Design a protein around this ligand. Structure first.
Ligand SMILES: [Mg+2]
Ligand SMILES: [Mg+2]
Ligand SMILES: [Mg+2]
Ligand SMILES: [Mg+2]
Ligand SMILES: [Mg+2]
Ligand SMILES: [Mg+2]
Ligand SMILES: [Mg+2]
Ligand SMILES: [Mg+2]
Ligand SMILES: [Mg+2]
Ligand SMILES: [Mg+2]
Ligand SMILES: [Mg+2]
Ligand SMILES: [Mg+2]
Ligand SMILES: [Mg+2]
Ligand SMILES: [Mg+2]
Ligand SMILES: [Mg+2]
Ligand SMILES: [Mg+2]
Ligand SMILES: [Mg+2]
Ligand SMILES: [Mg+2]
Ligand SMILES: [Mg+2]
Ligand SMILES: [Mg+2]
Ligand SMILES: [Mg+2]
Ligand SMILES: [Mg+2]
Ligand SMILES: [Mg+2]
Ligand SMILES: [Mg+2]
Ligand SMILES: [Mg+2]
Ligand SMILES: [Mg+2]
Ligand SMILES: [Mg+2]
Ligand SMILES: [Mg+2]
Ligand SMILES: [Mg+2]
Ligand SMILES: [Mg+2]
Ligand SMILES: [Mg+2]
Ligand SMILES: [Mg+2]
Ligand SMILES: [Mg+2]
Ligand SMILES: [Mg+2]
Ligand SMILES: [Mg+2]
Ligand SMILES: [Mg+2]
Ligand SMILES: [Mg+2]
Ligand SMILES: [Mg+2]
Ligand SMILES: [Mg+2]
Ligand SMILES: [Mg+2]
Ligand SMILES: [Mg+2]
Ligand SMILES: [Mg+2]
Ligand SMILES: [Mg+2]
Ligand SMILES: [Mg+2]
Ligand SMILES: [Mg+2]
Ligand SMILES: [Mg+2]
Ligand SMILES: [Mg+2]
Ligand SMILES: [Mg+2]
Ligand SMILES: [Mg+2]
Ligand SMILES: [Mg+2]
Ligand SMILES: [Mg+2]
Ligand SMILES: [Mg+2]
Ligand SMILES: [Mg+2]
Ligand SMILES: [Mg+2]
Ligand SMILES: [Mg+2]
Ligand SMILES: [Mg+2]
Ligand SMILES: [Mg+2]
Ligand SMILES: [Mg+2]
Ligand SMILES: [Mg+2]
Ligand SMILES: [Mg+2]
Ligand SMILES: [Mg+2]
Ligand SMILES: [Mg+2]
Ligand SMILES: [Mg+2]
Ligand SMILES: [Mg+2]
Ligand SMILES: [Mg+2]
Ligand SMILES: [Mg+2]
Ligand SMILES: [Mg+2]
Ligand SMILES: [Mg+2]
Ligand SMILES: [Mg+2]
Ligand SMILES: [Mg+2]
Ligand SMILES: [Mg+2]
Ligand SMILES: [Mg+2]
Ligand SMILES: [Mg+2]
Ligand SMILES: [Mg+2]
Ligand SMILES: [Mg+2]
Ligand SMILES: [Mg+2]
Ligand SMILES: [Mg+2]
Ligand SMILES: [Mg+2]
Ligand SMILES: [Mg+2]
Ligand SMILES: [Mg+2]
Ligand SMILES: [Mg+2]
Ligand SMILES: [Mg+2]
Ligand SMILES: [Mg+2]
Ligand SMILES: [Mg+2]
Ligand SMILES: [Mg+2]
Ligand SMILES: [Mg+2]
Ligand SMILES: [Mg+2]
Ligand SMILES: [Mg+2]
Ligand SMILES: [Mg+2]
Ligand SMILES: [Mg+2]
Ligand SMILES: [Mg+2]
Lengths: 275, 68, 114, 88, 100
RNA sequence: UGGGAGAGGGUGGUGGAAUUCCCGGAGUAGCGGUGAAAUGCGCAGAUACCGGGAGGAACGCCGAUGGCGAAGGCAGCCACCUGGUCCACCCGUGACGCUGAGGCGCGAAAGCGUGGGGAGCAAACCGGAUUAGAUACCCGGGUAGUCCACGCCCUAAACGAUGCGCGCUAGGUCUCUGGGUCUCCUGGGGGCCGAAGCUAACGCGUUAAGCGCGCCGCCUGGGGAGUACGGCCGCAAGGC
C-alpha cells in the first residue's frame, strides 16, 4: 500500500509515503555497512559531470550480495527485511546455517523466517538462485547476471522482473523489464521471483523539499537561460524552441538514437524495447 | 443408426474409454447431436462433459479434416 | 521435379487462388483469377476459378507433376468448379479434403460478419 | 463445507433434550454456524456478492428467531446469544 | 480427505531409467501432499489424437488416490514442474453412470 | 435425516481452434475489396503454401422451444471456497407468519480515477467511393475503449412494458428435473392450446390479466419537462 495524508498543509495534500509494512528491522547489520562517499555529482577533477545533485540525507551503504553462486548448496534463513536508502527495492538479511550473514534484494513474497538457497539443484521457489539454464522457461526471475560470475546486473529496481522466453544453445532468452528481447548466458545466475516494493512508483513526492532530501537539486530549463548557457536560451519575452530541441551540449533530444552502432553486444540483443 | 443402441452397458462418466467414445464423434470430429446419439437429456451432458475431458488428455480430437 | 504433391485452393467470395506444392509443402507454382487475366468482380466467378486451377495444373505438369492431393479452403462460389478443373486437367487427384479454418469463437469479426 | 460430525456436535450441544432438533436453540446455533463460515468466505472473496444475499437471508433468519425466543423466554434468549456470542 | 483420479502424461521418448526417475518424484510428491494411493493403472504409451509438445505419442499414468481437499491444487502445480511432465489432470472421483 | 439437478457466485490453474505480428523455407504478378470501383497493399518479393516463435481475446460441435439466479445476468476444461433450490422420509420446533415508508446491499452497456495489458474489433478521426451535397449508409486505415486489478458511476425497451405472499376455480399436449409400483401415478420448474370467468378490444386463462384477503409502490389530459429553482449524491459526465 501507499500512505496518504490529510491536507493540513498545502503539500501534505498530495504527498504520499511508503507503507513500510514489509519492514521488520529498522537497524542495519553493522558488519555489512560502510560509509557512502557522497559525490555531489563531481568527478576526480572536482568538475560537475552530472548536474543538479547534492544536499541529500546522509547515507550508509549496505553491502549487498549480487553473486550468490558464491555459496552454492548452503541454505540460509530470512532473518529480517530492511529499508535500504541506496535503492528502490527492499533488502533481506540472510542468516546462513554457515553462520555467514549477507544482504540480498528482497523479492516480492519473501517471508521472514523462510529458507532459501543457491545452486543448480535449488528448488524453483521464491528467493532461490540458480544458473539460468536450470530454471524452467516461463518462470519470472530477477537480479540477473549479464555475464557468468560478473554479478547481478539486470532487474534490480523495485517491482522489476525478467522472464525466460526460451532457450537457444548455451544461451537463454530473457525479456528484460524494458521489453527488450536479449540472449543471456545459461551459466548466468538469477533469483526466482519479481523484486518487491512494487508500489514504489505510486509515490507522490508532494513538495519541493522532498526532492531535496533525495539529493536532487533544482533542474533548470534551457528555455529559461541565455544563448551562452543553452541552445534554447534567450529570446525576447517567452519563446518556443526555434530549432530541433537540444541538450545544453548541442545534441538533439527528441528521438535521436544514441546506442553505439558497431557495438559487439548487438549480436545478442534480439528485439529492442517496445513503446 | 443411433449409437446408444449399437453398444452394451457403458459408462458415460468414463473419460478413458477411448474406443466407446470415438463412436460418438462425427467423421469431422464434432460431438454428435441427440438425434444421432439416442441419449436422453440428462445423459447427453455427462457424455459431452467427459468427451471434452478426453480431448484434453489427447485421446480425442478437437477437430478432424473432412475427406471426400 | 516432383510426381506426387499437393493442390491448395484458397477460394473466397471475391477470388479463387490455386497453389501447387510438393509433398513437403513447398509451392511449385500458383495461379488465380488475376493470373488468367480477369479483374474486378469477374475474379470470383466459377469460370475464373476453372481457368485458375488449370493454369495451376498446366505449369505443374511442366515440372513433372502427376499426382496431387487437393486441399480445399474457403466457401466461395467458384470452389467446386476449381475441383472440377483439376480432375479433368490430367492430374491424378489421389484425394480431396476440405480444410477451411473455423474458429472456436476466437476473435470478434468485422461489422459485416455479425 | 461443514462436516456432518461438527454439525452433530453443535446439534447435540444446543438440543433442549436428547432427541431435540429443529427447536429455537438448535435452529439458531446451526444458522450461527453457517453465518460465521460464510462471513469468513466473504472476507476473502469480497467479490462474491451472490452468496452475500444468502448471508443476509441467514442473518435475517437468525434474527427473526432470536426475536421469537426473546418474546417467549427472556432467560433462554439472553443465555443463547451469550453462549453463542451474538448481540452487537 | 477426498477421492480424486490423477492423470499424468510424460515424454514418450525417454528411456526406462529416466522414465523411472520422473515416477520417483511423482510417487514422493503424492506422499508429501498427503495423497495415499489406492488403485493404479500405468497404460504406458498411447497414440495421441493431436501432437503434444510436437510429439504424436504420450506415456500415460493414472492413480486413484485419497488426499486432503485443500492440498490437491498445489500438488497439481508441483506435478507440472517437470519438463517431461506434459499434462496433469486431477479429477474428483465419481461413481460410473451406466447406459442402456 | 437422506438424496438430486444446474452456463448460480468467487479464487487459482489450464486445453485446443482461429486472427494478428515476427523468424525460416519455397514460390511469382498480383492481392484485396465492391452493386460496380477506388483508396490500400505488392518485383524493396506481396497474396496463396509449409515449419517455427510471440501475444491478447473469445470459447466452435455438445446447444435445446434447455438449465441456473431476486434482478442485472451466467457457457471450453479442472480443482478449491460458496449461495440459492427441488424431491423423499413425515423425525424435531409450536404461528416463530406475510408485506414493507425510511435504511442497507446488489445492479447490463457506455462512462470516470490509478496502475497493468493490448491479437482482433472499433466511437472520434483520415482516406477511397456513392451523391446535387454525404460532416452518413459501402470500402482501406484508425485512437480511446473493449480485457485484468482496485475504487467510482447507479442509468435503460433494468420488459412478462404484468409488485410480493396466500387460498379457491375443467382439462388437452410438448419439455426439464426429482420420488413411487415407472402401464402410469405424484411433486417442482419451462412453453403451447384451451373450461369457467375476465377484458375497450387485442388477448389472459392453476406461470390469470379468473374469483378473493393482506401490505407496499404508482396513476389523475397533451406539451412545457424529467426542464427550472431548492436540496442530497458524484472526480466529472451526471443521477435522484
Ligand atoms: Mg504492500
Ligand atoms: Mg496524500
Ligand atoms: Mg495524515
Ligand atoms: Mg486520509
Ligand atoms: Mg491548508
Ligand atoms: Mg493548498
Ligand atoms: Mg520506498
Ligand atoms: Mg522512502
Ligand atoms: Mg507509512
Ligand atoms: Mg514497504
Ligand atoms: Mg541508526
Ligand atoms: Mg565498521
Ligand atoms: Mg569493526
Ligand atoms: Mg561507498
Ligand atoms: Mg560512493
Ligand atoms: Mg581524490
Ligand atoms: Mg585541479
Ligand atoms: Mg586537483
Ligand atoms: Mg550530465
Ligand atoms: Mg550537482
Ligand atoms: Mg528500500
Ligand atoms: Mg511517479
Ligand atoms: Mg505516474
Ligand atoms: Mg539521499
Ligand atoms: Mg526531476
Ligand atoms: Mg525547471
Ligand atoms: Mg531569461
Ligand atoms: Mg560563461
Ligand atoms: Mg559564443
Ligand atoms: Mg548556442
Ligand atoms: Mg531560442
Ligand atoms: Mg527567453
Ligand atoms: Mg536578457
Ligand atoms: Mg523569440
Ligand atoms: Mg528572455
Ligand atoms: Mg521587448
Ligand atoms: Mg513574443
Ligand atoms: Mg524567455
Ligand atoms: Mg517563463
Ligand atoms: Mg523563438
Ligand atoms: Mg522555427
Ligand atoms: Mg554483452
Ligand atoms: Mg469413471
Ligand atoms: Mg475480387
Ligand atoms: Mg436459511
Ligand atoms: Mg436482536
Ligand atoms: Mg511442464
Ligand atoms: Mg442436505
Ligand atoms: Mg516470408
Ligand atoms: Mg503457418
Ligand atoms: Mg448454439
Ligand atoms: Mg411429526
Ligand atoms: Mg409439542
Ligand atoms: Mg421481505
Ligand atoms: Mg426500501
Ligand atoms: Mg453498472
Ligand atoms: Mg463496463
Ligand atoms: Mg476513463
Ligand atoms: Mg479505464
Ligand atoms: Mg486523466
Ligand atoms: Mg490506460
Ligand atoms: Mg492496439
Ligand atoms: Mg470520409
Ligand atoms: Mg466526395
Ligand atoms: Mg459543401
Ligand atoms: Mg470501416
Ligand atoms: Mg480494420
Ligand atoms: Mg480520447
Ligand atoms: Mg483516457
Ligand atoms: Mg473522455
Ligand atoms: Mg435486460
Ligand atoms: Mg426478453
Ligand atoms: Mg420472470
Ligand atoms: Mg418502467
Ligand atoms: Mg405507457
Ligand atoms: Mg413491492
Ligand atoms: Mg423417476
Ligand atoms: Mg407445470
Ligand atoms: Mg393461451
Ligand atoms: Mg368463453
Ligand atoms: Mg376486474
Ligand atoms: Mg373484435
Ligand atoms: Mg395446465
Ligand atoms: Mg412459476
Ligand atoms: Mg386490465
Ligand atoms: Mg395543463
Ligand atoms: Mg400537463
Ligand atoms: Mg435533472
Ligand atoms: Mg435522466
Ligand atoms: Mg439544481
Ligand atoms: Mg427512476
Amino acid at each position: 500500500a501507499v500512505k496518504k495524508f490529510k491536507p493540513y498543509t498545502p503539500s501534505r495534500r498530495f504527498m504520499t509515503v511508503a507503507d513500510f509494512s514489509e519492514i521488520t528491522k529498522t537497524e542495519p547489520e553493522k558488519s555489512l555497512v560502510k560509509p557512502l562517499k557522497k559525490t555531489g555529482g563531481r568527478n576526480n577533477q572536482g568538475r560537475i559531470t552530472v548536474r543538479f545533485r547534492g544536499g541529500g540525507h546522509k547515507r550508509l551503504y549496505r553491502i549487498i550480495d549480487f553473486k550468490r553462486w558464491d555459496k552454492v548448496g548452503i541454505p540460509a534463513k530470512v532473518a529480517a527485511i530492511e529499508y535500504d536508502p541506496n535503492r528502490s527495492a527492499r533488502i533481506a538479511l540472510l542468516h546462513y546455517v554457515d553462520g555467514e550473514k549477507r544482504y540480498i534484494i528482497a523479492p516480492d513474497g519473501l517471508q521472514v523466517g523462510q529458507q532459501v538457497v543457491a545452486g543448480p539443484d535449488a528448488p524453483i521457489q521464491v528467493g532461490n538462485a540458480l544458473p539460468l539454464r536450470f530454471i524452467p522457461v516461463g518462470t519470472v526471475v530477477h537480479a540477473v547476471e549479464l555475464e557468468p560470475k560478473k554479478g547481478a546486473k539486470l532487474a534490480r529496481a523495485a517491482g522489476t522482473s525478467a522472464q525466460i522466453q526460451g532457450r537457444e544453445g548455451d544461451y537463454v532468452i530473457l525479456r528484460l523489464p524494458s521489453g527488450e528481447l536479449r540472449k543471456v548466458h545459461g551459466e548466468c545466475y538469477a533469483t526466482v521471483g519479481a523484486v518487491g516494493n512494487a508500489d514504489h512508483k505510486n509515490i507522490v513526492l508532494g513538495k519541493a523539499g522532498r526532492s531535496r532530501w533525495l539529493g536532487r537539486r533544482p533542474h533548470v530549463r534551457g528555455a529559461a537561460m541565455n544563448p551562452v548557457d543553452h541552445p534554447h536560451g534567450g529570446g525576447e519575452g517567452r519563446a518556443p524552441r526555434g530549432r530541433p530541441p537540444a541538450s545544453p551540449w548541442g545534441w538533439q533530444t527528441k528521438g535521436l538514437k544514441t546506442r553505439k552502432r558497431r557495438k559487439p553486444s548487438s549480436r545478442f540483443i534480439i528485439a529492442r524495447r517496445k513503446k | 443408426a443411433k449409437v446408444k443402441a449399437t453398444l452394451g452397458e457403458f459408462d458415460l462418466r468414463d473419460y478413458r474409454n477411448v474406443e466407446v467414445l470415438k463412436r460418438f464423434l462425427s467423421e469431422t470430429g464434432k460431438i454428435l447431436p441427440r438425434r444421432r446419439t439416442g441419449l436422453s437429456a440428462k445423459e447427453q451432458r455427462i457424455l459431452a462433459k467427459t468427451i471434452k475431458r478426453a480431448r484434453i488428455l489427447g485421446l480425442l480430437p478437437f477437430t478432424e479434416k473432412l475427406v471426400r | 521435379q516432383v510426381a506426387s504433391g499437393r493442390a491448395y485452393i484458397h477460394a473466397s467470395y471475391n477470388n479463387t487462388i490455386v497453389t501447387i506444392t510438393d509433398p513437403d509443402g513447398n509451392p511449385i507454382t500458383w495461379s488465380s483469377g488475376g493470373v488468367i487475366g480477369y479483374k474486378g468482380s469477374r475474379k470470383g466467378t466459377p469460370y475464373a476459378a476453372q481457368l485458375a486451377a488449370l493454369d495451376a495444373a498446366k505449369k505443374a505438369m511442366a515440372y513433372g507433376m502427376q499426382s496431387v492431393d487437393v486441399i480445399v479452403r474457403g466457401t466461395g462460389a467458384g470452389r467446386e468448379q476449381a475441383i472440377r478443373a483439376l480432375q479433368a486437367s490430367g492430374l491424378q487427384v489421389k484425394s480431396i479434403v476440405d480444410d477451411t479454418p473455423v474458429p472456436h469463437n476466437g476473435c470478434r469479426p468485422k461489422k459485416k460478419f455479425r | 463445507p461443514i462436516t456432518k460430525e461438527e454439525k452433530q456436535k453443535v446439534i447435540q450441544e444446543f438440543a433442549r433434550f436428547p432427541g431435540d432438533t429443529g427447536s429455537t436453540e438448535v435452529q439458531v446455533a446451526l444458522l450461527t454456524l453457517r453465518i460465521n463460515r460464510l462471513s469468513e468466505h466473504l472476507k476473502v472473496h469480497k467479490k462474491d456478492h451472490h452468496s452475500h444475499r444468502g448471508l443476509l437471508m441467514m442473518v435475517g433468519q437468525r434474527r427473526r428467531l432470536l426475536r421469537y425466543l426473546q418474546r417467549e423466554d427472556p432467560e433462554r434468549y439472553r443465555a443463547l446469544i451469550e453462549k453463542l456470542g451474538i448481540r452487537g | 480427505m477426498r477421492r480424486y483420479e490423477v492423470n499424468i502424461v510424460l515424454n514418450p521418448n525417454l528411456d526406462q531409467s529416466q522414465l523411472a526417475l520422473e515416477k520417483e518424484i511423482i510417487q514422493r510428491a503424492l506422499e508429501n501432499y498427503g495423497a495415499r494411493v489406492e488403485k493404479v493403472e500405468e497404460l504406458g504409451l498411447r497414440r495421441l489424437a493431436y501432437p503434444i509438445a510436437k510429439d504424436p505419442q504420450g506415456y500415460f499414468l493414472w492413480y486413484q488416490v485419497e488426499m486432503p481437499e485443500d492440498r490437491v491444487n498445489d500438488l497439481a502445480r508441483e506435478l507440472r514442474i517437470r519438463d517431461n511432465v506434459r499434462r496433469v489432470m486431477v479429477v474428483k472421483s465419481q461413481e460410473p453412470f451406466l447406459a442402456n
